[PDB]
Design a protein around this ligand. Structure first.
Ligand SMILES: CC(=O)N[C@H]1[C@H](O[C@H]2[C@@H](O)[C@@H](CO)O[C@H](O[C@@H]3[C@H](O)[C@@H](O)[C@H](O[C@H]4[C@H](O)[C@@H](O)[C@H](O)O[C@@H]4CO)O[C@@H]3CO)[C@@H]2O)O[C@H](CO)[C@H](O)[C@@H]1O[C@@H]1O[C@H](CO)[C@H](O)[C@H](O)[C@H]1O
Length: 197
């Protein structure tokens, strides 16, 4: 009988980027990087064995995610619009969403394994994620009506790896975008720039 275990491992990283001096018709950029690290299970869905002892085959489908806001409000109520500049090999999906960009990288599929493993780790459990993916470069559209000077903007967002283990070849599952939208946003980009007329 068939089973599928899917576990989302969330990375919490804090980074800053200097977007340098800009006038208000320029779109300063920032680069978000994927830093291998310790991730925490923030979601799962499982109906199969929780532990592979080594004696039997299972199949892996791994997909990295980034969920990133499309707009960032300042404390006074002004919006900063977040635009894609270069997303490398990330797949930009569910583009009609009001609020959030969804970037996916499905890098492993149909891959048979016998490796002993924990196939349904529970939320709050941690593991080390060694994988590395492309940077994403964002540009920011500043408002004409927005005011001047030095700015420091904290931007929370979600990144992590979906690991899907299945009993069969050809197994496919993608975390629904509505689920990905509401996952904990454990990363932070502190974006700095100096504004001018
Ligand atoms: C099946 C599916 O969900 N298709 C939709 C696609 O999902 C994939 C993307 O998110 C990518 C992002 O990198 O990850 C997953 O796919 C990976 C890997 O990236 C693919 O190369 C690989 O594809 C294999 C396939 O599995 C093998 O069967 C085949 O022989 O070779 C290919 C190429 O090597 O699949 C793995 C599986 O993990 C994930 O499944 O996302 C797309 C948007 O980016 C679409 O939503 C796509 O759905 C299709 O879109 C088309 C045309 O536009 C129609 O709407 C179809 O109706 C629909 O199924």
């Amino acid at each position: 009988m068939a089973w599928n275990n899917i576990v989302f491992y969330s990375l919490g990283d804090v980074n800053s980027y200097q977007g340098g001096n800009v006038v208000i018709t320029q779109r300063p950029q920032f680069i978000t990087s994927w830093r291998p690290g310790i991730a925490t299970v923030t979601w799962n869905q499982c109906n199969g064995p929780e532990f592979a002892d080594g004696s039997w085959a299972y199949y892996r489908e791994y997909i990295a995610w980034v969920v990133f806001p499309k707009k960032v409000m300042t404390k006074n109520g002004y919006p900063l619009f977040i635009e894609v500049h270069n997303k490398g090999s990330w797949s930009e999906e569910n583009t009609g969403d009001n609020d959030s960009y969804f970037f996916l990288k499905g890098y492993k599929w149909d891959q048979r394994a016998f490796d002993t493993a924990n196939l349904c780790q529970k939320p709050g459990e941690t593991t080390r994620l060694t994988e590395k993916f492309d940077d994403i470069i964002f540009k920011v559209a500043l408002p004409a009506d927005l005011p001047l000077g030095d700015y420091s903007v904290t931007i929370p967002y979600t990144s992590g790896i979906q690991r899907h283990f299945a009993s069969y070849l050809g197994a496919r599952f993608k975390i629904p975008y509505n689920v990905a939208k509401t996952l904990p946003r454990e990363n932070e980009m502190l974006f700095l720039f100096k504004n001018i007329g």
